[PDB]
From a paper:
During the processing of the cryo‐EM data of hTRPV4A2, a subset of particles showed additional strong EM densities attached to the ARDs, which was further refined to a nominal resolution of 3.44 Å with C4‐symmetry imposed, indicating that an endogenous protein that interacts with hTRPV4 may have been copurified during the protein expression and purification processes. To identify which protein binds to hTRPV4, we performed a mass spectrometry analysis on the purified sample utilized for the cryo‐EM study; the results clearly showed that Ras Homolog Family Member A ([name]) is one of the primary components present in the sample. The resulting hTRPV4A2‐[name] structure adopts a C4 symmetric conformation, which also possesses a dilated SF (11.1 Å) and a constricted inner gate (4.4 Å) similar to the other three hTRPV4 structures, implying that the binding of [name] may stabilize the channel in a closed state. Structural comparison of hTRPV4‐[name] with hTRPV4GSK279 showed that the ARDs underwent anticlockwise rotation upon [name] binding. The hTRPV4A2‐[name] structure demonstrated that [name] engages in extensive interactions with finger 2–4 loops of the ARD, burying a total solvent‐accessible surface area of 700 Å2. More specifically, groups of polar interactions (located at Switches I and II of [name]) play a critical role in stabilizing the inaction. In Switch II, D76 of [name] establishes a salt bridge with R237 on finger 2 and R269 on finger 3 of hTRPV4 ARD. In Switch I, residues A2, R5, and E54 of [name] form a hydrogen‐bond network with residues H265, D313, R315, and R316 from ARD fingers 3–4 of hTRPV4. Additionally, N41 of [name] forms a hydrogen bond with the carbonyl‐oxygen of N228 of hTRPV4.
Residue numbers in the entry:
A (entry chain D): 203 to 606
B (entry chain C): 203 to 337
C (entry chain D): 674 to 788
D (entry chain C): 607 to 638, 662 to 741
The structure:
Amino acid sequence: SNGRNDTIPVLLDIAERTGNMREFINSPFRDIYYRGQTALHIAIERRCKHYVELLVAQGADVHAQARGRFFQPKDEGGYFYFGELPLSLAACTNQPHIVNYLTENPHKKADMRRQDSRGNTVLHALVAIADNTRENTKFVTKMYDLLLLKCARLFPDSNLEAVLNNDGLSPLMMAAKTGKIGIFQHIIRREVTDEDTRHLSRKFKDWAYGPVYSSLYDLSSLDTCGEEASVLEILVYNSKIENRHEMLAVEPINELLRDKWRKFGAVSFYINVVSYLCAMVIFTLTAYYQPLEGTPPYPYRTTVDYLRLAGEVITLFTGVLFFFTNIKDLFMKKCPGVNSLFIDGSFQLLYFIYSVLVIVSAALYLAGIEAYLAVMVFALVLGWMNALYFTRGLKLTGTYSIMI
Amino acid sequence: SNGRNDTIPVLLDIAERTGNMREFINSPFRDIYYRGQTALHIAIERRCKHYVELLVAQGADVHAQARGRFFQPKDEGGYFYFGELPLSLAACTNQPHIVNYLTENPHKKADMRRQDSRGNTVLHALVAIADNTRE
Amino acid sequence: FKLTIGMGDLEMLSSTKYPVVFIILLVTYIILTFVLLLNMLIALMGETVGQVSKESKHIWKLQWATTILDIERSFPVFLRKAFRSGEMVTVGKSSDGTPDRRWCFRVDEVNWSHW
Amino acid sequence: QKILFKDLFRFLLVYLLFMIGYASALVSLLNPDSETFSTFLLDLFKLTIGMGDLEMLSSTKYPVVFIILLVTYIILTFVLLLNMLIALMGETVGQVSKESKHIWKLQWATTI
Ligand SMILES: Cc1nc(C)c(-c2csc(Nc3ccc(C(=O)N4[C@@H]5CC[C@H]4CN(c4ncc(C(F)(F)F)cn4)C5)cn3)n2)s1
């Protein structure tokens, strides 16, 4: 009633005279639909600071995990996932005063580095509840910064962001692959002007000379060369379809990609082009010079036969290389479906068909005498329509191939 | 520190006691990446009118040309081209008061018609730094 | 199919009775074939280009980025370490006074507004 | 002039790539040899126009696969034509509809 139920203090007094005060404070719900939730969670959700203060005074467990089926992510049959922890719940409903009291009280302090059943810390939960709307991000970023700075001041030895959940993620990577641009950009571009804990910033100002400001970003986790699950690979591959295009446009991501291009990316793609064309013209020459009289394998005695054998073996080597690369690619990442097949999946599908055609052509060449020409010619047919793969380098030809 | 370094007058006094005050004021950088820049350029760029006043009074070369590789147009491997001149530098960072002081002071006035190595006058440099943005 | 292309024989058209319905149905056949071609063309010229305006640019960006990342991944660890973007800038003293020594990345901007 | 030079290079390159690939494959599989290559090459464009011969279509075995491949060749030629149409139409609306007046003005000024 109007935020105050006067019978609670007297009820707690009766309980403490009875001798089960601690047993009474934290009584968890037992139904499968509300398991784990205690009175502390209800007090925090009700946004009643006085009641949670009075409830934790006598020994309320500030680490009781509300892991019921109601407190699950919306994708797992639930309504509200706040992080399965009283402090995570307080930080996930925009109650800075409740967080300040829980983290700093004489009675019992709940450390912000604690992880729930899922392994998500307070920052992970705050990322999980974050939305792309302006108003939600407005306080999500504020609470994230507040919690990180408070943990740094309390525990200068470690960084709260560096903890990994049971999925191996971090708040930055979790926001990257979940699709929360609002907190992703804030985490990437955050800067701590305060000198006490300036080390946990990812954007410094190197130097300035008049109207020329040089700000240097941090790529300690954006590019690690296959060592710490770089955010770039996660964003390009594992992120959701809708937000990926505009979340790949953050200030140090586009510059990093263009630098990789101009460094090794720009001409590695071109070499690939010339090698593919050379191998393909070798394929065509081997195709045209195959004799139509005789059952394979043929007798190789002349220099023309030696050249034909060299072309055949180089074709088989290229085909098996393409097959191995496609197999490794399909093993590394799960098979995509709609909204991701048109990115590349169709193209390595055609290249897989090409490798299969080359392999089956070799199998027939081993024993069969007939239909070798047909299957090899059809492989060549599929080959020169796969030259449309190397059109992304040019602005227009990429689309020219995409619509085809 | 907070726009004021108290050691400058003491250093200048020591220099004028030891007899290399003029040598000490205009000390050009020797590296390829910052050649020509003098203390006057740093004072102007820092937006400290008091120090540019207190530095030019003793005979700072108000025509020293900062023609290093850093002070080159962005098309020739550089970050900031301001006209290679203290007056051009003051005019290219929106400092009307420092321009007024440099053009009108009892000690040594830099004429606005002076041209740098490229021949660009103050107006040419001000055109060069201009962008199409409204501000 | 031969009549679909256009080259055909009139003798077989009326060889097996019922010529009027044959002619009408074959004419509607060609009309429907033309309508199906137009059914491709309408979505090809207008709606496909409507997607090309923005979604094609986005898919180009993804297609180029994924090739860059695959090219990087195929390289061994030490080669990628040699071809590592960004400088090796030290930031400042740590809690114990040690330098940060963090692989940062410098981007330059020009701002005439704030002084 | 964009049609005749600017994109004609790309269109011709793609067309010649597809044509050389398909013609080389077809001639390579067929058996009777330089003259036969040219004869079948010109027969390829003859069938492309539409006037062709049935006897030489199934001249050397494998009837179904050559029928399918020739159908695909005709389909891809039509697809290249329609890709030319689609590239001309819509993609450059935002460019042409605004830049036509500008390029008129530049050409008229430089003529003066
Ligand atoms: C869509 C795709 N999926 C896969 C699996 C793809 C794939 C993986 S590897 C590959 N094909 C390769 C492999 C390796 C090399 C190779 O030896 N190199 C690369 C990088 C260093 C060295 C020399 N080079 C280069 N050196 C300096 C500059 C400077 F001037 F900028 F400094 C520019 N370039 C290019 C070339 N090509 N293709 S692609």
